[PDB]
Design a protein around this ligand. Structure first.
Ligand SMILES: C[C@]1(O)CC[C@H]2[C@@H]3CCC4=CC(=O)CCC4=C3C=C[C@@]21C
Lengths: 11, 242
């Protein structure tokens, strides 16, 4: 999974 | 009303590339700027998608997926609209500080791809696409590419997609059928263009270390993990026409 992307999604 | 009010409200504002226009054009500088702009736009795509009607109803892994697969097409479509509305398709308006004329199209070595994007931009004027039609189509573009092995919860995705197509019908409403025909053709035309760019960026990432082109972290990862799935036929766009 794209760590940086998932962060933005759940941020 | 409601649906269109939302799309207009969440539409991202202007995004700059941070390109140095005072320096002479170079392959590496233009592509590095495009990549940085791509990263910046990806950030805006996530914030935008998160606020779309029904998007959070999708499984989280599917939210990630459609964003990662649709990113290129979404950027191409929006850029085509910006070019049309800001310079009447004369040039490619990637950003206020990154406008591509024919010389840059050639220097970047993406000429053939740029000509195709310029054509898409001209279609917005030829078809007299309205700002509201543009918004609904762009939203539908996010739900136009999926894995052949299916999504975590394909049912919810299909329902969301169906609802966006319904909204497009309402916006359109023999005249209606003719309009739906041209808009769906326009939407389909985005896919081949995005595929060409997918191939181009993939090749560029593979040799970036030798051509001195920098790729931001998120992009590099999407391009090395998700893009190949598209290029290898594992993930394919949903075309209206064959
Ligand atoms: C330069 C490159 O790596 C290849 C094609 C490029 C694409 C072309 C389409 C595009 C349109 C925009 O308005 C945002 C930036 C943007 C890009 C940014 C980086 C990419 C992916």
């Amino acid at each position: 999974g794209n760590a940086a992307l998932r962060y933005l999604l759940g941020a | 009303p409601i649906f269109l009010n939302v799309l207009e409200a969440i539409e991202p504002g202007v995004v700059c590339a941070g390109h140095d226009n005072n320096q002479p054009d170079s392959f590496a500088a233009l592509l590095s700027s495009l990549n940085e702009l791509g990263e910046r736009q990806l950030v805006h795509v996530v914030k935008w998608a998160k606020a779309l009607p029904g998007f959070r109803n999708l499984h989280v892994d599917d939210q990630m997926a459609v964003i990662q697969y649709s990113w290129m097409g979404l950027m191409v479509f929006a850029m085509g609209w910006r070019s049309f509305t800001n310079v009447n398709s004369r040039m490619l308006y990637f950003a206020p500080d990154l406008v591509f004329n024919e010389y840059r199209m050639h220097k970047s070595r993406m000429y053939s791809q740029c000509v195709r994007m310029r054509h898409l931009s001209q279609e917005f004027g030829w078809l007299q696409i309205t700002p509201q039609e543009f918004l609904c189509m762009k939203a539908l573009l996010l739900f136009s590419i999926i894995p052949v092995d299916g999504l975590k919860n394909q049912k919810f995705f299909d329902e969301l997609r169906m609802n966006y197509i319904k909204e497009l019908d309402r916006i359109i409403a023999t005249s209606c059928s003719r309009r739906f025909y041209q808009l769906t053709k326009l939407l389909d035309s985005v896919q081949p263009i995005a595929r060409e760019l997918h191939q181009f960026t993939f090749d560029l990432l593979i040799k970036s270390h030798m051509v001195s082109v920098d790729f931001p972290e998120m992009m590099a990862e999407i391009i090395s993990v998700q893009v190949p799935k598209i290029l290898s036929g594992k993930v394919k766009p949903i075309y209206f026409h064959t």
